[PDB]
Design a protein around this nucleic acid. Structure first.
Lengths: 39, 213, 806, 125, 823
RNA sequence: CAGCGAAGGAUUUGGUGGAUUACUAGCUAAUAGCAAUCUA
């Protein structure tokens, strides 16, 4: 990160129950997103 | 009525240009003599396969019309004719000579039959292009053929080839030059008068296609 | 047709300020950038306000009537806005850096806290007209010694309780005739007191320090004045308190810390109810609905927010965005959901109807350079600097293929055959185009011919020829398939960026580095024409550069162009703050948008303020870097006139609302909306329909369209003339996507493309954006309704026809 | 001092330099007048930059063109390319940029080989 | 008249009018309260920004104002308004019909004087409150005691005295007992100014002949006299920074600085303000400051600073002349032509009858600055013509802006009065452009326009020729010659395809560019005096001379609208930037709005002065009108942007009135209809178990149900059921209390049966049935063939069978849509 | 050389003043006093 932020033109910005996981994939209320081959 | 005034001082420049040239700046004519407009492909099916909508000055455009497939069917028909006319073992490369002899050719085409020689050569192409032929299919290696039809690119190409080599073969050992020989061949082909080499070979090929149909 | 108002800002769901619910628990106001977004929760929608601030905003409030809000940025340039009309009302300059503003529960007085002074002002009215100086100052109080940190009212508008980075926290009466009722000052905390709250009756005063202490002041005895009754504590060790709120009637405290944690308590008992975290970066702002069911937590550094229902633990929306890393864009081929590819390496998937994400893809390690969609909606490819072009299914929402090179080279642009059988990517350091089969993941080939890096790629959507553009000042056309592998080069003047080819697949627009954009017919190599696009893109002079904006040449060119979907208008965007759009037959600019008008971004102003210049160095390079403004990739939507542009503040999305315009079509003296409504009430429905189309007023189209009855929709749909089909087809699409009369719409579509299907069939590109919205409507409401009604049918049939009793 | 502009033009090995400046309307190739240019059948290939767009655009400039190398047809293509882009560059710098891209539209609609030579060839099939 | 679309906002670009201003101090600050016609304005004096304005106008014009510390005392027809921060805090109605003339403030006693030598003095009720609110008494000077009044003031260190200055005599008062005390001597000519001195108890008073008497009222004498030849004196002041300097201001536009310690003219100033607009109306030193604030009647306020001396030893003998410091002005005559510069509605341009051009800024009113007439030198060798003296330009008639190539070459064009050519300007660097576009047929310029690509300018001469020019060289391109009298309007499209000419002959000529032929000609039956093209929507509205506003669309060349109804010449239009309205002002003192869809007249404001020019902002929020009189420019705020307005033809269904249209519930009962609102209610209801299971971190209804059961209709139950939250819907429907009889299950299935019988909300009724089936369909499958629930399911499917036409429809439409979009 | 062309023409450069963000007045111990003083 530090070497490719100085080698670039455009700016780069940089226990409890859960950290809540706000960046979630797979979500259109999907549970069995597996393929039938994969089952 | 109405007018549009674009120029406000006439053309008086220091190198005095010829008057026919500064008259040709109003509209482009081939060789400064023949207007490309009011020239129509009388046939259908060869329109947009003989380029006449884009006027030129001389027949020596240096574009690239052999790298793609069909883009040799877009360079204009006059220099298509002169490029086929340059083809023989004695006189390859000499397309300036080819340009000037088709200049003399279509000039005397005009002075004989005066409509405009580009119209003469366009409907000469449409009348000379064959509409069917055969193909020598195997059939056990017999005397076996079958009539097929001809795509218009092959029609235009074979018409140009027939006209040029007919002019060459009729001007081989005669008093006439290749210029006036191509002129009379194009005039006979424009009338479709069944006399010239190309129209004779066209009717012969369609005859054997109809026979072996 | 080309009057794109600023519709929405997708991405960056919160960055900086204070979240605020409305009065009714329906809308959530989030301080997104220099603008304010509004998320409508139940009608699952959103918008962003069109007005802009000159720096990042830092205070939001609207009155409890929900009528007008004010918003204050970093230097106090307060802007107030009719909330129900979305227009600005008045600008104002409070002279110093505000921290918190609060309207009254009455909503007739708002007080704010600029620096150490607090000041009560009285509000203007929505009903009284736009005065010149509408703000009448009520009073200003100066009882503090350092900056105020927070501010609250009583439940009535009589007392106002303020708290500061000065260790004390004080109280005030709003009139001059309640000075004995409250004038005192509450000392006693160790660190910055940032919470001060009345109870539900105004007798208990809860105060909250920074280091986790909570005192409960109460007006009791050893006349007698505000004895602290209890020192409750938090005991989070390295987590000092960052943001406090307190719902009074349900008696709910909510505290977010430095550690990225929050807790909500029932305060008058002091019982911990919930303690949990959202990440390793602090909860910058809590706010709570008036009915106490919902809370809202904003964390600034990762740019996330979360509305949480605490009674039944069900999250209404949890969202996370980016900043200045929005490296490319794509639409789904039905213009319903958007894909944002961002430079930290992740693939957010937004949707346009709402404003929210629905799926990230945290897979790549380094940056993701470009994405695009393929194979009938539901495959999209993403191309990175990891050395990876990887596929993504957008139904199972998973990866399924990953093509690499042979040596880990960074990729920069990709394209994909519309018949999704080959995927092509181009790099900065190999001069080649890598082709992969996609049904089998092996490397098909690498095809060459350039001698500089390939800047951009595309596939023709019909005849499958490929067009690449590279810094050899060269565009190159490959015919790959069908036994030939035939190349054809085309020279251009300067080096090339940003190829984009027309939806006919007949010509190609390239955006060269000299500020020009050329168009090449690809059946020939012939240039049709070019637009000099240089002298009409305002490039902002930066803070640190020592040349003028005129002689600057940082961005006097474009870096991503795109066509419209009729092949008639190029939108273009670059590393400057202008996104322009041109129309290619007349070859002329027809609109230029500026993307941002705040100086917090770097390259916005072409003329910097002279007072900041000193004897040596400007006064903004003195640290106590600044992000440039770029528009990395721009696309027109498939199913709208709208278009999106991915800039440093996320996706800007501009759109047409043909509601507010008079955009008629060959009317004359007789045709009048009164004439169409009389033609409808004398029921010549075809004549009233074309009589409404000529007005091109969409509410007349709505009225005539609804008032046509069912038994002759085939008759009018037969008799409707040819030149109105794009208008009626696109109208039925963009009204039916959010309408309700589903059987009416489907009768209309069936009538239309039964009576005139062939005309569409021979004018596919005339209706390409028309009947894509129709297919979006079909497969995204009507097919779902049919799916559940068939599931009910089959579950009934099974639960009757089968038996069993044991 | 006097407003001038120098452009180039290249066919296969012929090279043409064009000094275009403000003047009275004289067009000279190696001191010879523009009319006396061999091989006399491509004099219109030389003429078409000053003939497509009308001599009124040539009334105020004068052009001197040096040519080296190549044969006859290469020299006349080099001459016409140098004349064309010299006129375009003069109108880009000293007069109307609107007239500049008018001229560029005219030349590119006729043939862009009159503005950009096709250099990078051949192909290893 | 009152309006209903546009509300008036502010008259911008206006600084002074000629009333003597006043000044006030706050700490170590200084504010200048100047009058502008009816409202006043409060500048500060350090940076001379605007600070305040009156929040609403006065009934008459303000005749006299003064200022104490926070408060501004305005004075008009019969009253005196005590104001604070530009807001009126107390009216004071005088006990007469006589018009008030002058006033003064001192201590407690306010003192105003009417136009018949009657002096109402007022007193503060409490010697501690902020302003004099209570009438104390009424003195009256009679013609025995002196002439008719010309000023009054309380000079300093006088125990509740006052000094009335008449035209012939000075006369004191003791205002507590209402007594006169000391009439002065006789004065042999009319005096017109009297200002006190910062020395003890003397007052300087200047006459109509140019002499200043210095009356010592304690002594009752005169001390000295400054004689000046034939100068109508207007305004005195003194400088109070120690070095004694008197300063007279002569109504011939002169400002003379006298020393008093050695009776010498320090420096004269000639033609500081214009002569004919009153000269130096009021000039004063700020006390303790070596600066001067002058104000003329010519809409100008200036500050002149005295520099420190260059003689460090001599000092007070060598005085440096006054420099010029900050100043704020407008043009001093009513503005002829008015444009809006940018799309942001920030800058606007005026050009006035006094031949000056200004760029006003309606955002912040210290940004307004004059454009400058300094010619760019001819770099081809020529010499600048015109005259040798730099007079201002001839009067501006028309002009045209296109901010598309702003500052890169020349930007805006203008068209002057009766001169044969039409010079151009630049807006970014704000001065005169290089070139002068000429008509080439000796006709004066009458119309100017330019392309929105910022290249081509368009001159339309009085002899019908339209010459077009390029604006980065200044050369001519082509000369369109169609008309045979004065061309009055030029425009060109957005995309430069077709242009429109508009003559006085009635010929409207539709030409196109890039092929210089014309393609359309229209003849109207009147002469034409104006044309406004709406470049967005391709309509353009023309004045006529039978008072029509003929709106023609440029594509099919129809006369598409004809707005009738004016009584005199229509001086101006503008399109609303949406193109819905034409606002047109005309010489019957009216300004009307035309809703051009309906062709109607929405409202007509009867404005008191005839509005010459009317312009809408690039964005639809501001309507700037300029009138026959008034030095300013009145901007108007349309309330139509904040609330929707009617459409109703006035002369001195509600949905098509208010331009809107709500969608009906369903067209009939034969048609299906989804639920009103979000289309995600279906997905959240079908998946809210897995939604909460993925979003987890690691009765009234039964009452209504049996009510509707015994009343045998469930419409009230369904109206309850539809519209509450999915969590509460599932938590309610999950528990339905059904062990033996299942009456509740039969009631619910019959309720959904009655619901989807109506063909309404049927997506919601389908997902409610599916929610019940996932909830406790196990008991339905268990005691299947229970007669009641089997009857409920039987007639439920018998009503469900009608909903197969939906999937027939959509599986038709999807297949044929895919076929016509692929093949 | 020419012409343009009202009692000069054409350039170099300093200083001051106004803009470069959207105009609600100053100070203090601030529900008030000050602006001549916060002291008893």
């Amino acid at each position: 990160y530090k070497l490719d932020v100085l080698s670039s033109v455009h700016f780069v910005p940089k226990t409890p129950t859960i950290s809540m996981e706000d960046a979630q994939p797979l979500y259109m209320s999907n549970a069995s997103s597996l393929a039938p081959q994969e089952i | 009525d109405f007018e549009v005034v674009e120029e406000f001082t006439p053309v008086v420049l220091a190198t005095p240009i010829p008057e026919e040239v500064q008259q040709a700046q109003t509209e482009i004519k081939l060789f400064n003599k023949w207007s490309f407009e009011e020239v129509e492909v009388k046939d259908a099916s060869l329109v947009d396969y003989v380029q006449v909508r884009q006027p030129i000055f001389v027949a020596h455009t240096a574009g690239r019309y052999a790298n793609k497939r069909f883009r040799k069917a877009q360079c204009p028909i006059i220099e298509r004719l002169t490029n086929s006319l340059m083809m023989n073992g004695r006189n390859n490369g000499k397309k300036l000579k080819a340009v000037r002899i088709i200049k003399h050719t279509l000039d005397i085409i005009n002075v004989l039959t005066d409509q405009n020689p580009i119209q003469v050569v366009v409907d000469a192409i449409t009348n000379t292009g064959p509409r069917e032929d055969t193909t020598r299919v195997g059939g056990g290696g017999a005397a076996r053929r079958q009539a097929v039809d001809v795509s218009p690119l092959r029609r235009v190409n074979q018409a140009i080839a027939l006209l040029t080599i007919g002019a060459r073969e009729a001007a081989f050992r005669n008093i006439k030059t290749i210029a006036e020989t191509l002129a009379e061949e194009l005039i006979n082909a424009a009338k479709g008068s069944s006399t010239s080499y190309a129209i004779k070979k066209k009717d012969e090929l369609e005859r054997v296609a109809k026979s072996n149909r | 047709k080309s009057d794109f108002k600023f519709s929405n800002l997708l991405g960056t769901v919160y960055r900086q300020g204070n979240i605020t619910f409305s009065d009714d628990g329906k809308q959530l106001l989030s301080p997104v950038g220099n603008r304010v977004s509004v998320f409508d929760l139940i009608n699952n929608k959103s918008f962003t306000f069109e007005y802009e601030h000159r720096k990042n905003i830092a205070a939001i409030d609207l009155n409890k009537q929900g009528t007008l809000l004010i918003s204050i940025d970093e230097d106090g340039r307060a802007i107030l806005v009719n909330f129900k009309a979305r227009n600005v009302l008045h600008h104002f300059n409070f002279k110093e850096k505000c921290s918190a503003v609060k309207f009254s529960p009455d909503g007739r007085l708002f007080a704010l806290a600029s620096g150490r002074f607090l000041q009560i002002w009285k509000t203007p009215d929505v009903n009284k007209d736009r005065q010149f100086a509408p703000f009448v100052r009520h009073r200003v109080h100066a009882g503090h010694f350092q900056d105020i940190t927070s501010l609250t009212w009583s439940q009535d508008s009589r007392f106002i309780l303020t708290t500061s980075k000065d260790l004390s926290a004080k109280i005030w009466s709003v009139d001059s005739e309640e000075k004995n009722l409250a004038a005192t000052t509450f000392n006693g905390h160790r660190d910055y007191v940032m919470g001060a709250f009345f109870s539900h009756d105004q007798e208990k005063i809860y105060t909250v320090s920074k280091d986790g202490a909570v005192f409960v002041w109460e007006f009791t005895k050893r006349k007698y004045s505000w004895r602290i009754t209890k020192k409750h504590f938090f005991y989070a060790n390295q987590a000092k308190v960052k943001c406090v709120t307190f719902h009074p009637a349900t008696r709910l405290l909510a505290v977010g810390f430095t550690s990225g944690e929050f807790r909500l308590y029932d305060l008058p008992d002091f019982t911990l109810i919930q303690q949990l975290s959202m990440g390793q970066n602090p909860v910058n702002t809590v706010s709570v609905n008036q009915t106490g069911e919902w809370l809202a937590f904003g964390s600034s550094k990762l740019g996330q927010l979360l509305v949480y229902e605490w009674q039944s633990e069900s999250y209404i929306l949890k969202q996370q965005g980016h900043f200045d890393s929005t490296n490319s864009l794509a639409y789904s081929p039905d213009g319903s959901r958007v894909v944002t590819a961002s430079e930290d390496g992740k693939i957010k998937v937004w949707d346009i109807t709402s404003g929210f994400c629905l799926a990230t893809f945290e897979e790549h390690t380094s940056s993701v350079t470009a994405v695009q969609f393929a194979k009938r909606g539901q495959v999209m490819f993403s191309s990175s600097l990891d050395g990876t072009v990887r596929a993504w299914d957008l139904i199972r929402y998973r990866n399924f293929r990953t093509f690499t090179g042979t040596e880990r080279i960074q990729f920069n642009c990709l394209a994909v055959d519309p018949s999704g059988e080959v995927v092509c990517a181009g790099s900065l350091d190999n001069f080649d185009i890598h082709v992969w089969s996609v049904q089998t993941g092996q490397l098909l080939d690498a095809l060459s011919g350039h001698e500089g890096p390939v800047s951009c790629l595309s596939f023709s959507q019909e005849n499958s020829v490929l067009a690449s553009a590279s810094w050899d000042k060269t565009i190159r056309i490959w015919s790959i398939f069908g036994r030939s592998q035939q190349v054809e080069p085309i020279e251009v003047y300067s080096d090339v960026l940003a190829l984009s080819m027309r939806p006919d697949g007949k010509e190609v627009a390239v955006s060269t580095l000299k500020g020009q954009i050329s168009i090449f017919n690809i059946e020939d190599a012939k240039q049709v024409g070019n637009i000099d696009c240089r002298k009409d893109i305002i490039s902002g002079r930066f803070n640190q550069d020592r040349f003028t904006a005129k002689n600057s040449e940082r961005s006097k060119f474009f870096t991503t162009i795109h066509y419209s979907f009729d092949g008639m208008a190029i939108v273009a965007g670059g590393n400057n703050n202008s996104i322009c759009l041109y129309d290619v037959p007349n070859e002329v600019l027809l609109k230029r948008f500026i993307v941002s008008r705040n100086m917090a971004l770097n390259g916005t102003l072409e003329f910097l303020n002279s007072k900041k210049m000193t004897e040596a160095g400007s006064l903004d390079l003195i640290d106590d870097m600044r992000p440039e403004v770029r528009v990395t990739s721009v696309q027109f939507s498939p199913t709208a006139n709208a278009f999106a542009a991915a800039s440093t503040e996320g996706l800007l999305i501009y759109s047409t609302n043909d509601t507010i315009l008079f955009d008629p079509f060959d009317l004359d003296v007789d045709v009048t909306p009164h004439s169409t409504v009389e033609a409808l009430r004398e029921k010549q429905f075809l004549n009233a329909l074309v009589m409404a189309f000529r007005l091109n007023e969409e509410y007349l189209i709505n009225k005539v369209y609804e008032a046509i009855p069912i038994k002759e929709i085939p008759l009018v749909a037969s008799n409707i003339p040819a030149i109105y089909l794009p208008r009626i087809l696109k109208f039925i699409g963009d009204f039916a996507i959010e309408s309700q009369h589903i059987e009416f719409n489907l009768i209309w579509i069936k009538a239309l493309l039964s009576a005139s299907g062939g005309y569409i069939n021979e004018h596919k590109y005339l209706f390409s954006t028309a009947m894509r919205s129709i297919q979006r409507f079909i497969v995204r409401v009507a097919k779902e309704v049919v799916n559940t009604t068939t599931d009910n049918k089959y579950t009934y049939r099974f639960l009757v026809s089968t038996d069993g009793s044991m | 001092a006097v407003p001038s502009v120098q452009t180039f033009g290249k066919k296969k090995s012929a090279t043409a330099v064009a000094h275009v400046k403000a003047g009275k309307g004289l067009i000279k190739v190696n001191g010879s007048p523009i009319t006396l240019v061999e091989p006399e059948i491509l004099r219109f290939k030389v003429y078409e930059p000053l003939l497509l767009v009308g001599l009124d655009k040539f009334s105020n400039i004068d052009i001197r063109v040096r040519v080296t190398g190549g044969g006859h047809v290469s020299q006349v293509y080099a001459i016409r390319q140098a004349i064309a882009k010299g006129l375009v560059a003069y109108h880009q710098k000293y007069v109307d940029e609107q007239s500049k891209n008018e001229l560029k539209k005219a030349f590119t609609s006729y043939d862009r080989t009159l503005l950009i030579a096709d250099s990078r060839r051949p192909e290893p099939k | 008249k009152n309006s209903k679309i546009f509300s008036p906002f502010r008259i911008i670009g206006n600084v002074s009018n000629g009333v003597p201003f006043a000044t006030g101090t706050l700490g170590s600050t200084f504010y200048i309260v100047t009058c502008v016609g009816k409202t006043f304005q409060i500048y500060d004096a350090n940076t001379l920004h605007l600070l305040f304005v009156s929040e609403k106008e006065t009934p008459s014009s303000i005749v006299a104002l003064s200022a104490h510390f926070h408060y501004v005392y305005a004075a008009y027809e019969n009253k005196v308004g005590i104001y604070k921060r530009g807001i009126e805090e107390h009216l004071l109605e005088l006990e007469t019909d006589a018009n008030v003339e002058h006033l003064c403030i001192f201590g407690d006693y306010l003192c105003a004087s009417t136009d018949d030598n009657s002096i109402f003095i007022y007193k503060k009720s409490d010697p501690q409150d902020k302003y004099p609110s209570e009438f104390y008494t009424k003195l009256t000077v009679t013609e025995i005691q002196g002439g008719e009044i010309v000023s009054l003031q309380h000079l300093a260190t006088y125990l509740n005295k006052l000094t009335v200055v008449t035209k012939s005599n000075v006369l004191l008062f003791n205002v507590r007992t209402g007594k006169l005390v000391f009439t002065s001597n006789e004065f042999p000519d009319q005096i017109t100014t009297a200002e006190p001195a910062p020395v003890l108890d003397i007052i300087a008073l200047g006459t109509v002949t140019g002499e200043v008497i210095m009356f010592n009222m304690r002594k009752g004498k005169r001390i000295r006299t400054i004689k000046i030849p034939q100068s109508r004196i207007s305004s005195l002041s003194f400088r109070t920074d120690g070095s004694s300097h008197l300063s007279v201001g002569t109504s011939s536009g002169d400002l003379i600085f006298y020393d008093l310690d050695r009776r010498s003219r320090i420096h004269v100033l000639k033609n500081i303000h214009r002569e004919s607009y009153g000269g130096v109306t009021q000039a004063t030193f700020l006390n303790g400051q070596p600066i001067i604030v002058t104000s003329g009647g010519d809409n100008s306020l200036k500050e002149y600073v005295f520099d420190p001396s260059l003689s460090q030893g001599s000092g007070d003998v060598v005085v440096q002349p006054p420099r010029y410091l900050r100043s704020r002005g407008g043009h001093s005559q009513p503005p002829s032509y008015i444009a809006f510069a940018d799309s942001q509605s920030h800058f606007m341009l005026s050009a006035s009858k006094d031949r000056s051009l200004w760029s006003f800024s309606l955002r912040k009113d210290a940004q307004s600055q004059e454009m400058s007439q300094r010619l760019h030198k001819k770099q081809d060798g020529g010499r600048v013509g015109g005259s040798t003296i730099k007079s201002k330009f001839p009067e501006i008639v028309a002009l045209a802006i296109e901010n598309a190539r702003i500052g890169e070459w020349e930007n805006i064009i203008t068209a002057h009065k009766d001169e044969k050519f039409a010079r151009t300007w630049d807006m970014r660097n704000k001065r005169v452009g290089r070139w002068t576009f000429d008509t080439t047929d000796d006709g004066f310029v009458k119309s100017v326009a330019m392309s929105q690509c910022g290249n081509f300018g368009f001159i339309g001469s009085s002899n019908g020729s339209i010459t077009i020019y390029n604006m980065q060289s200044g050369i001519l391109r082509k000369k369109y010659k169609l008309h045979k009298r004065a061309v009055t309007g030029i425009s060109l499209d957005g995309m430069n395809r077709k242009m429109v000419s508009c003559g006085l002959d009635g010929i409207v000529g539709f030409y196109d560019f890039n092929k210089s032929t014309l393609l359309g000609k229209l003849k109207l039956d009147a002469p034409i005096t104006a044309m406004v093209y709406h470049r967005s929507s391709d309509l353009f509205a023309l004045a006529l001379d039978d008072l029509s506003i003929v709106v023609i669309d440029a594509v099919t060349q129809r006369v598409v609208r004809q707005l009738w109804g004016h009584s005199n010449r229509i001086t101006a239009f503008d399109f609303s930037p949406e193109g819905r309205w034409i606002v047109s002002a005309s010489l019957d003192s009216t300004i009307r709005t035309w809703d051009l869809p309906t062709g109607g007249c929405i409202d007509g404001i009867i404005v008191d002065n005839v509005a010459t020019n009317v312009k809408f902002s690039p964005n639809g929020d501001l309507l700037a009108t300029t009138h026959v009189t008034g030095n300013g420019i009145c901007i108007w705020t349309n309330r139509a942007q904040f609330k929707t307005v009617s459409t109703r033809t006035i002369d001195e269904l509600n949905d098509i009135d208010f331009n809107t249209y709500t969608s009906l519930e369903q067209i009939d009962k034969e048609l299906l209809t989804l639920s009103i609102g979000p289309r995600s209610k279906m997905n959240t209801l079908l998946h809210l178990d897995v939604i909460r299971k993925r979003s987890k971190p690691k009765s009234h209804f039964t009452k209504q149900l049996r009510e509707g059961s015994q009343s045998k209709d469930y419409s009230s139950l369904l109206a309850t059921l539809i519209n509450f939250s999915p969590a509460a819907v599932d938590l309610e429907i999950r528990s339905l209390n059904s062990f033996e009889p299942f009456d509740e299950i039969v009631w619910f299935i019959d309720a959904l049966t009655q619901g989807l019988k109506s063909n309404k909300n049927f997506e919601l009724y389908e997902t409610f049935m599916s929610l019940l089936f996932k909830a406790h369909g196990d008991v339905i499958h268990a005691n299947n063939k229970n007669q009641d629930i089997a009857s409920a399911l039987q007639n439920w499917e018998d009503v469900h069978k009608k909903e197969d036409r939906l999937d027939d429809l959509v599986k038709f439409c999807m297949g044929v849509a895919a076929f016509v979009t692929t093949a």
